[PDB]
């Protein structure tokens, strides 16, 4: 069964993850369906184990 | 059964995770469905074990 | 059954997690469905074990 | 049954977790569905064991 | 069963992940269906194990 | 009249001064005419003010 | 009159000064006429003010 | 009158000054007439002010 | 009157000064008339102010 | 009156100064009349101010 070995060496790391910036705007969205993982070493793992599973990411919905 | 081995060495790390910045704006969103994990070493693991599971991330909804 | 081994060495770490900043704005949201984990070493683990489970993250909803 | 081994060595760590900052704004939200964990070593673990479980994080709702 | 071995050595890394920037705009979206993983070493793994699974990423929907 | 301004800032310093090491040897010498100054900040100042002054450093002398 | 301004900033320094090492040898010398100054910041100043001054450094002398 | 301004910034420095190493040898010399200054920042200044001054560095002398 | 301004910035420096190494040899010399200055920043200044001054560096002398 | 301005920027420097190496040899010399200055930034200045000054560097002398 699967192995997610991650091995990392660095002397320096500078990391900027997600920046959302707005001036004088309307209706700005940064929808993320999964995790937001930010690191010198960064690992995201997701397992969905079943039938009929739904993953549904939407920025915005406007009905009338 | 699966192994998420993460091994990390660094001398320095500088990490900025999620920044959401607004001036004079309306309706600004940073919806995240999973975790927000921020680190020199950063790991997010999610397991969903079942049938018919729903993951549904939406920034915003406007009905009438 | 799964192993989440995380091994970390660092001499220095500077970490900034989630910043939400607003001036003169309206309706600003940073909805996070999971945990917010911020660390020199940062680990988030979530297990959902069942059928029909729902994960539903939404920034905002406006009905009439 | 699963093992969340976390091993950490650091000489220095500086960590800033969640900042929510507002000036002259209205309706600013930092909804977090899980824990907020902030540490030089930071670990969040959540287990939900059952069928039909709901996780539902929403910034704000406005009906009429 | 599959192995996702990642091995990394670097002396320096500077990483900027996702930037969404808006001025005087309306209706700006950066919908991401999976994780957002940002790192000097960055790994995202997703496994969906079942029949009839849906992955559905949409920027925005407007009905009337 | 002269100014020996020394200004130093360091976060870490490791300093090894004078090592003299011998195994199974004969007649090993580390003659130093001035001071031996060893420090994270190290300053040696010597002033000789007169006529006919002698400075004479010799490791060893063997007459018959 | 003269100014010996020394201004130093460092984050790390590792310094090894004078090593004299011998195995199974004879008659090994490290004669130094002035100071031995070893430091992350290291300054040696010598002033000789007079006529007919002698500086005479010799490793070894053997007459008969 | 003269100015010996030295200004230094470094993040890291590793410095090895004078090594004299001998195995199974005879009559090995490292005569130095002035100072031995070893540093991340290293300054040696010598002033001799007079007539007829002698500086005389010799490794070794053998008369009969 | 003269100015010896030295201005230095470096991120890393590795410096090895004077190495004298001998195996199974005889009569090995590293005579240096002035200072030995070893540094990430290294400055040697010598002023001799007078008439008839002698600087005389000799490795070795053998009379009969 | 003269100005010896030295201005240096480097990201990395590796410097090896003077190496004298001998195996099974006799009478090996590295006579240096002035200073030995070794650095990422290295400056040697010598001023001799007078009439009839002698600078005399000799490896070795053998009379009978
Ligand atoms: Cl960021
Ligand atoms: Cl941030
Ligand atoms: Cl923050
Ligand atoms: Cl904070
Ligand atoms: Cl970014
Ligand atoms: Cl020592
Ligand atoms: Cl040493
Ligand atoms: Cl050394
Ligand atoms: Cl050396
Ligand atoms: Cl060398």
XYZ file of C-alpha atoms and ligand atoms in Angstrom:
650
model
C 0.000 0.000 0.000
C 1.234 3.301 -1.225
C 4.159 5.214 0.251
C 4.446 8.997 0.057
C 8.067 9.391 1.098
C 9.195 13.030 0.879
C 12.810 13.822 1.743
C 14.059 17.401 1.670
C 17.258 19.289 2.439
C 17.631 22.997 1.833
C 19.842 25.681 3.282
C 17.352 28.525 2.772
C 13.717 28.709 1.767
C 11.426 31.708 1.303
C 7.821 30.793 0.491
C 4.710 32.911 -0.084
C 1.573 30.806 -0.298
C -1.738 32.315 -1.415
C -2.129 36.082 -1.693
C -5.533 37.527 -2.579
C -5.420 41.302 -2.966
C -8.247 43.683 -3.840
C -8.626 47.428 -4.148
C -11.942 49.088 -5.045
C -13.201 45.735 -6.371
C -16.355 43.711 -5.880
C -16.953 39.973 -5.675
C -13.413 38.581 -5.575
C -13.030 34.925 -4.643
C -10.222 32.403 -4.148
C -12.201 29.227 -3.552
C -9.963 26.173 -2.971
C -11.544 22.730 -2.873
C -8.742 20.945 -1.013
C -6.209 22.043 1.571
C -3.914 25.040 1.282
C -0.459 23.775 2.284
C 2.472 26.205 2.355
C 5.939 25.210 3.478
C 9.619 24.907 2.788
C 8.480 21.290 2.598
C 4.771 21.118 1.772
C 2.699 17.946 1.397
C -1.041 17.586 0.854
C -2.605 14.140 0.691
C -6.304 13.438 0.249
C -7.912 10.023 -0.082
C -11.598 9.559 -0.887
C -12.615 5.906 -0.652
C -16.168 5.183 -1.743
C -18.535 5.109 -4.674
C -20.431 8.121 -5.941
C -18.262 10.669 -4.149
C -18.590 14.287 -5.278
C -15.900 16.953 -5.244
C -17.435 20.245 -6.346
C -15.544 23.542 -6.149
C -17.304 26.694 -7.342
C -16.215 30.289 -7.127
C -19.682 31.811 -6.840
C -23.278 31.086 -7.844
C -25.898 33.751 -8.573
C -29.460 32.714 -9.260
C -32.063 35.348 -9.854
C -1.390 0.539 4.631
C -0.059 3.803 3.395
C 2.906 5.652 4.873
C 3.265 9.429 4.690
C 6.900 9.750 5.710
C 8.095 13.368 5.483
C 11.721 14.114 6.338
C 13.015 17.683 6.282
C 16.249 19.505 7.071
C 16.698 23.211 6.510
C 18.962 25.854 7.956
C 16.520 28.736 7.437
C 12.898 28.984 6.406
C 10.662 32.027 5.956
C 7.044 31.162 5.151
C 3.971 33.332 4.569
C 0.801 31.276 4.332
C -2.484 32.842 3.213
C -2.844 36.613 2.942
C -6.220 38.129 2.077
C -6.027 41.903 1.716
C -8.804 44.348 0.871
C -9.139 48.100 0.587
C -12.412 49.832 -0.339
C -13.727 46.499 -1.660
C -16.917 44.527 -1.172
C -17.591 40.800 -0.989
C -14.074 39.353 -0.888
C -13.763 35.689 0.036
C -11.009 33.116 0.548
C -13.036 29.964 1.095
C -10.823 26.891 1.687
C -12.435 23.462 1.761
C -9.664 21.615 3.610
C -7.130 22.653 6.216
C -4.788 25.614 5.929
C -1.364 24.277 6.937
C 1.612 26.651 7.024
C 5.052 25.595 8.174
C 8.725 25.239 7.474
C 7.529 21.642 7.257
C 3.825 21.534 6.404
C 1.670 18.421 5.999
C -2.075 18.130 5.468
C -3.676 14.700 5.280
C -7.390 14.056 4.852
C -9.060 10.671 4.510
C -12.754 10.254 3.714
C -13.839 6.620 3.950
C -17.407 5.955 2.868
C -19.777 5.916 -0.061
C -21.599 8.971 -1.339
C -19.403 11.482 0.478
C -19.648 15.105 -0.662
C -16.909 17.726 -0.633
C -18.387 21.044 -1.731
C -16.447 24.312 -1.523
C -18.160 27.495 -2.707
C -17.000 31.070 -2.456
C -20.433 32.673 -2.172
C -24.038 32.019 -3.190
C -26.609 34.731 -3.916
C -30.200 33.781 -4.578
C -32.724 36.501 -5.115
C -2.861 1.145 9.242
C -1.372 4.334 7.992
C 1.647 6.089 9.472
C 2.100 9.857 9.287
C 5.747 10.124 10.291
C 7.007 13.722 10.081
C 10.649 14.395 10.936
C 11.997 17.940 10.911
C 15.260 19.706 11.705
C 15.753 23.409 11.181
C 18.075 26.006 12.620
C 15.695 28.940 12.100
C 12.076 29.248 11.077
C 9.885 32.322 10.625
C 6.257 31.503 9.818
C 3.222 33.732 9.245
C 0.010 31.749 9.010
C -3.244 33.370 7.873
C -3.553 37.149 7.631
C -6.900 38.728 6.758
C -6.639 42.504 6.405
C -9.370 45.010 5.558
C -9.634 48.773 5.285
C -12.876 50.562 4.352
C -14.229 47.244 3.032
C -17.453 45.322 3.499
C -18.196 41.608 3.694
C -14.712 40.082 3.822
C -14.472 36.411 4.750
C -11.755 33.797 5.267
C -13.824 30.663 5.774
C -11.673 27.539 6.326
C -13.354 24.143 6.377
C -10.604 22.267 8.226
C -8.065 23.259 10.846
C -5.659 26.173 10.571
C -2.258 24.784 11.587
C 0.753 27.114 11.698
C 4.158 25.987 12.894
C 7.815 25.586 12.153
C 6.561 22.014 11.887
C 2.849 21.977 11.063
C 0.665 18.890 10.620
C -3.087 18.674 10.084
C -4.754 15.278 9.870
C -8.473 14.678 9.446
C -10.190 11.321 9.089
C -13.891 10.976 8.301
C -15.028 7.357 8.519
C -18.609 6.761 7.444
C -20.975 6.782 4.512
C -22.771 9.859 3.252
C -20.530 12.327 5.067
C -20.717 15.956 3.935
C -17.938 18.535 3.979
C -19.354 21.884 2.897
C -17.366 25.122 3.136
C -19.012 28.335 1.927
C -17.797 31.889 2.238
C -21.203 33.554 2.482
C -24.815 32.981 1.437
C -27.333 35.750 0.734
C -30.947 34.880 0.079
C -33.444 37.635 -0.424
C -4.193 1.726 13.905
C -2.661 4.892 12.640
C 0.408 6.584 14.090
C 0.926 10.345 13.934
C 4.585 10.517 14.917
C 5.924 14.086 14.718
C 9.579 14.685 15.559
C 10.985 18.209 15.551
C 14.265 19.917 16.390
C 14.820 23.615 15.908
C 17.190 26.177 17.343
C 14.880 29.167 16.814
C 11.267 29.518 15.778
C 9.118 32.622 15.301
C 5.475 31.879 14.474
C 2.473 34.163 13.923
C -0.785 32.248 13.689
C -4.016 33.939 12.579
C -4.267 37.722 12.308
C -7.602 39.353 11.474
C -7.276 43.124 11.104
C -9.991 45.660 10.292
C -10.132 49.428 9.982
C -13.342 51.299 9.110
C -14.764 48.026 7.744
C -18.005 46.131 8.214
C -18.806 42.427 8.376
C -15.341 40.857 8.497
C -15.186 37.182 9.424
C -12.542 34.513 10.016
C -14.650 31.389 10.439
C -12.532 28.243 10.989
C -14.265 24.870 10.973
C -11.554 22.943 12.828
C -8.999 23.919 15.443
C -6.530 26.782 15.176
C -3.169 25.310 16.231
C -0.099 27.570 16.423
C 3.259 26.368 17.717
C 6.903 25.928 16.900
C 5.615 22.372 16.565
C 1.905 22.387 15.735
C -0.338 19.347 15.256
C -4.094 19.197 14.729
C -5.808 15.825 14.512
C -9.534 15.275 14.075
C -11.324 11.962 13.675
C -15.029 11.676 12.885
C -16.243 8.084 13.098
C -19.840 7.581 12.025
C -22.186 7.665 9.078
C -23.908 10.783 7.815
C -21.635 13.186 9.676
C -21.759 16.816 8.548
C -18.951 19.361 8.590
C -20.330 22.728 7.511
C -18.281 25.926 7.775
C -19.858 29.192 6.620
C -18.579 32.720 6.970
C -21.958 34.445 7.224
C -25.562 33.925 6.119
C -28.037 36.735 5.434
C -31.668 35.940 4.760
C -34.139 38.734 4.333
C 1.365 -0.497 -4.686
C 2.557 2.830 -5.882
C 5.411 4.787 -4.326
C 5.637 8.569 -4.557
C 9.241 9.036 -3.484
C 10.318 12.689 -3.732
C 13.914 13.570 -2.875
C 15.100 17.173 -2.966
C 18.294 19.085 -2.227
C 18.611 22.793 -2.909
C 20.742 25.518 -1.411
C 18.202 28.320 -1.918
C 14.560 28.444 -2.911
C 12.219 31.406 -3.347
C 8.629 30.425 -4.150
C 5.492 32.501 -4.744
C 2.399 30.328 -4.945
C -0.943 31.749 -6.081
C -1.436 35.503 -6.371
C -4.860 36.884 -7.264
C -4.809 40.662 -7.621
C -7.681 42.978 -8.512
C -8.110 46.718 -8.838
C -11.438 48.327 -9.780
C -12.630 44.952 -11.111
C -15.765 42.902 -10.591
C -16.316 39.159 -10.347
C -12.757 37.818 -10.245
C -12.306 34.172 -9.310
C -9.447 31.703 -8.874
C -11.383 28.509 -8.222
C -9.090 25.495 -7.625
C -10.636 22.039 -7.468
C -7.780 20.289 -5.655
C -5.264 21.430 -3.072
C -3.019 24.466 -3.352
C 0.451 23.249 -2.353
C 3.336 25.728 -2.323
C 6.844 24.806 -1.282
C 10.526 24.588 -1.984
C 9.464 20.950 -2.096
C 5.752 20.718 -2.885
C 3.702 17.528 -3.229
C -0.029 17.097 -3.762
C -1.511 13.612 -3.932
C -5.195 12.824 -4.360
C -6.746 9.379 -4.666
C -10.427 8.844 -5.461
C -11.372 5.169 -5.242
C -14.912 4.388 -6.339
C -17.297 4.264 -9.255
C -19.221 7.260 -10.524
C -17.080 9.834 -8.733
C -17.516 13.443 -9.867
C -14.891 16.179 -9.839
C -16.449 19.457 -10.944
C -14.607 22.788 -10.822
C -16.424 25.898 -12.041
C -15.422 29.520 -11.857
C -18.911 30.984 -11.532
C -22.499 30.193 -12.510
C -25.139 32.838 -13.249
C -28.687 31.796 -13.971
C -31.272 34.432 -14.627
C 45.947 61.092 18.720
C 44.911 57.854 17.164
C 41.536 56.175 17.597
C 41.107 52.401 17.440
C 37.334 52.188 17.171
C 36.154 48.587 16.706
C 32.426 47.957 16.317
C 31.112 44.412 15.998
C 27.736 42.698 15.779
C 27.378 38.973 15.309
C 24.669 36.442 16.015
C 27.032 33.472 16.388
C 30.784 33.131 16.606
C 32.967 30.039 16.984
C 36.674 30.808 17.381
C 39.689 28.542 17.925
C 42.841 30.488 18.690
C 46.261 28.812 18.766
C 46.592 25.027 18.761
C 50.013 23.407 19.150
C 49.828 19.620 18.862
C 52.642 17.074 19.102
C 52.920 13.305 19.076
C 56.258 11.476 19.338
C 58.021 14.732 18.397
C 60.938 16.681 19.816
C 61.638 20.402 20.057
C 58.325 21.924 18.970
C 57.876 25.634 19.636
C 55.168 28.270 19.225
C 57.005 31.448 20.180
C 54.805 34.571 19.885
C 56.421 37.974 20.300
C 53.231 39.920 21.033
C 49.988 39.022 22.752
C 47.757 36.117 21.792
C 44.233 37.563 21.613
C 41.291 35.256 20.860
C 37.694 36.457 20.924
C 34.512 36.819 18.958
C 35.834 40.379 18.898
C 39.614 40.384 19.317
C 41.894 43.429 19.497
C 45.614 43.618 20.224
C 47.286 47.014 20.437
C 50.949 47.594 21.241
C 52.762 50.922 21.308
C 56.520 51.233 21.786
C 57.585 54.851 22.242
C 61.334 55.367 22.411
C 64.532 55.217 20.422
C 66.579 52.079 19.917
C 63.810 49.707 20.978
C 64.307 46.035 20.112
C 61.654 43.441 19.334
C 63.311 40.050 18.924
C 61.286 36.839 18.622
C 63.169 33.561 18.189
C 61.858 30.028 18.261
C 64.973 28.392 19.699
C 68.737 28.933 19.818
C 71.314 26.148 20.103
C 74.957 26.984 20.627
C 77.429 24.208 21.135
C 46.157 61.446 13.854
C 45.202 58.170 12.337
C 41.871 56.417 12.803
C 41.519 52.637 12.664
C 37.747 52.362 12.425
C 36.628 48.739 11.987
C 32.911 48.042 11.615
C 31.658 44.477 11.291
C 28.324 42.685 11.038
C 28.039 38.957 10.543
C 25.377 36.384 11.246
C 27.804 33.473 11.673
C 31.558 33.174 11.910
C 33.781 30.118 12.329
C 37.473 30.952 12.716
C 40.525 28.744 13.268
C 43.627 30.775 14.030
C 47.077 29.161 14.112
C 47.446 25.380 14.118
C 50.895 23.820 14.475
C 50.776 20.032 14.206
C 53.645 17.548 14.413
C 53.985 13.784 14.408
C 57.349 12.001 14.680
C 59.072 15.276 13.734
C 61.956 17.268 15.156
C 62.601 20.998 15.417
C 59.271 22.473 14.311
C 58.737 26.175 14.952
C 55.998 28.765 14.446
C 57.777 31.945 15.480
C 55.556 35.053 15.160
C 57.129 38.471 15.610
C 53.931 40.389 16.370
C 50.667 39.456 18.035
C 48.476 36.505 17.112
C 44.933 37.898 16.891
C 42.047 35.533 16.120
C 38.431 36.644 16.079
C 35.220 36.950 14.159
C 36.466 40.536 14.168
C 40.243 40.605 14.604
C 42.446 43.705 14.782
C 46.166 43.951 15.498
C 47.806 47.359 15.717
C 51.460 48.003 16.496
C 53.197 51.368 16.584
C 56.952 51.749 17.032
C 57.946 55.389 17.461
C 61.680 55.998 17.597
C 64.881 55.900 15.610
C 66.982 52.797 15.123
C 64.274 50.369 16.212
C 64.844 46.703 15.371
C 62.234 44.058 14.618
C 63.938 40.692 14.217
C 61.969 37.450 13.911
C 63.911 34.209 13.476
C 62.674 30.653 13.494
C 65.811 29.069 14.938
C 69.563 29.666 15.121
C 72.180 26.914 15.399
C 75.807 27.818 15.918
C 78.327 25.077 16.361
C 46.352 61.828 9.016
C 45.494 58.507 7.543
C 42.219 56.661 8.060
C 41.955 52.873 7.914
C 38.186 52.525 7.704
C 37.133 48.885 7.246
C 33.424 48.130 6.895
C 32.208 44.550 6.575
C 28.897 42.711 6.336
C 28.674 38.978 5.817
C 26.071 36.352 6.543
C 28.559 33.492 6.969
C 32.320 33.259 7.215
C 34.582 30.234 7.661
C 38.265 31.107 8.061
C 41.356 28.956 8.610
C 44.421 31.046 9.354
C 47.903 29.504 9.444
C 48.329 25.730 9.459
C 51.811 24.243 9.809
C 51.759 20.452 9.562
C 54.662 18.012 9.769
C 55.070 14.258 9.758
C 58.470 12.550 10.057
C 60.149 15.844 9.102
C 62.997 17.883 10.524
C 63.557 21.624 10.792
C 60.204 23.037 9.675
C 59.602 26.731 10.287
C 56.828 29.276 9.735
C 58.555 32.481 10.785
C 56.284 35.551 10.463
C 57.776 39.005 10.918
C 54.536 40.865 11.668
C 51.283 39.898 13.336
C 49.163 36.892 12.434
C 45.591 38.207 12.199
C 42.762 35.785 11.403
C 39.133 36.830 11.305
C 35.893 37.103 9.424
C 37.085 40.707 9.464
C 40.861 40.843 9.889
C 43.020 43.975 10.067
C 46.731 44.300 10.792
C 48.303 47.741 10.982
C 51.947 48.421 11.774
C 53.627 51.817 11.866
C 57.375 52.256 12.317
C 58.307 55.915 12.739
C 62.028 56.598 12.857
C 65.222 56.556 10.858
C 67.387 53.492 10.395
C 64.728 51.015 11.494
C 65.355 47.355 10.663
C 62.775 44.680 9.917
C 64.539 41.345 9.505
C 62.632 38.064 9.210
C 64.647 34.868 8.769
C 63.486 31.285 8.795
C 66.646 29.745 10.238
C 70.389 30.393 10.433
C 73.049 27.682 10.709
C 76.661 28.653 11.223
C 79.258 25.980 11.641
C 46.543 62.155 4.158
C 45.810 58.770 2.763
C 42.569 56.863 3.272
C 42.379 53.073 3.152
C 38.614 52.682 2.940
C 37.612 49.024 2.509
C 33.920 48.196 2.157
C 32.779 44.591 1.848
C 29.496 42.704 1.606
C 29.352 38.968 1.080
C 26.787 36.317 1.843
C 29.311 33.491 2.287
C 33.077 33.337 2.540
C 35.393 30.355 2.984
C 39.063 31.291 3.375
C 42.188 29.190 3.944
C 45.210 31.344 4.679
C 48.712 29.859 4.756
C 49.207 26.095 4.803
C 52.711 24.667 5.157
C 52.728 20.878 4.928
C 55.680 18.506 5.156
C 56.137 14.757 5.134
C 59.558 13.094 5.448
C 61.194 16.402 4.462
C 64.012 18.491 5.879
C 64.518 22.243 6.119
C 61.141 23.583 4.991
C 60.475 27.269 5.585
C 57.657 29.758 5.016
C 59.320 32.997 6.076
C 56.988 36.020 5.760
C 58.431 39.494 6.223
C 55.179 41.327 6.978
C 51.948 40.309 8.653
C 49.888 37.261 7.756
C 46.295 38.504 7.512
C 43.513 36.031 6.715
C 39.869 37.010 6.587
C 36.620 37.202 4.711
C 37.735 40.831 4.745
C 41.508 41.046 5.171
C 43.600 44.223 5.365
C 47.305 44.623 6.086
C 48.810 48.097 6.267
C 52.442 48.853 7.052
C 54.059 52.280 7.125
C 57.802 52.778 7.570
C 58.696 56.451 7.965
C 62.411 57.173 8.080
C 65.618 57.150 6.100
C 67.801 54.100 5.647
C 65.163 51.610 6.765
C 65.853 47.961 5.942
C 63.309 45.254 5.182
C 65.127 41.952 4.761
C 63.287 38.637 4.455
C 65.361 35.473 4.051
C 64.258 31.873 4.073
C 67.432 30.403 5.558
C 71.159 31.136 5.756
C 73.866 28.473 6.036
C 77.459 29.512 6.522
C 80.102 26.884 6.918
C 46.810 62.429 -0.726
C 46.125 59.023 -2.085
C 42.905 57.098 -1.518
C 42.760 53.307 -1.626
C 39.003 52.843 -1.794
C 38.071 49.164 -2.200
C 34.395 48.261 -2.539
C 33.321 44.636 -2.875
C 30.074 42.692 -3.152
C 29.995 38.955 -3.726
C 27.479 36.269 -2.905
C 30.035 33.476 -2.421
C 33.798 33.376 -2.141
C 36.179 30.451 -1.678
C 39.832 31.469 -1.316
C 42.987 29.416 -0.736
C 45.978 31.614 -0.006
C 49.508 30.189 0.094
C 50.064 26.432 0.140
C 53.593 25.063 0.485
C 53.682 21.276 0.263
C 56.681 18.958 0.472
C 57.216 15.219 0.485
C 60.682 13.656 0.784
C 62.230 16.994 -0.228
C 65.013 19.115 1.201
C 65.444 22.873 1.440
C 62.048 24.145 0.281
C 61.305 27.817 0.866
C 58.454 30.261 0.248
C 60.057 33.515 1.358
C 57.690 36.514 1.060
C 59.094 39.998 1.564
C 55.803 41.780 2.268
C 52.580 40.715 3.935
C 50.559 37.638 3.058
C 46.948 38.827 2.803
C 44.216 36.310 1.988
C 40.559 37.211 1.770
C 37.320 37.345 -0.124
C 38.349 40.992 -0.016
C 42.113 41.257 0.434
C 44.135 44.474 0.653
C 47.839 44.928 1.342
C 49.297 48.422 1.543
C 52.918 49.240 2.316
C 54.480 52.694 2.388
C 58.217 53.254 2.814
C 59.044 56.945 3.187
C 62.748 57.731 3.292
C 65.955 57.773 1.311
C 68.195 54.764 0.864
C 65.587 52.236 1.972
C 66.375 48.594 1.192
C 63.882 45.830 0.475
C 65.730 42.541 0.078
C 63.960 39.187 -0.268
C 66.072 36.054 -0.676
C 65.059 32.430 -0.709
C 68.237 31.040 0.842
C 71.947 31.838 1.080
C 74.681 29.201 1.355
C 78.272 30.251 1.781
C 80.906 27.605 2.108
Cl 1.109 34.882 0.799
Cl 0.379 35.279 5.425
Cl -0.371 35.821 10.134
Cl -1.140 36.415 14.940
Cl 1.793 34.391 -4.040
Cl 42.781 26.458 20.059
Cl 43.597 26.759 15.440
Cl 44.465 27.107 10.732
Cl 45.331 27.340 5.935
Cl 46.255 27.616 1.332
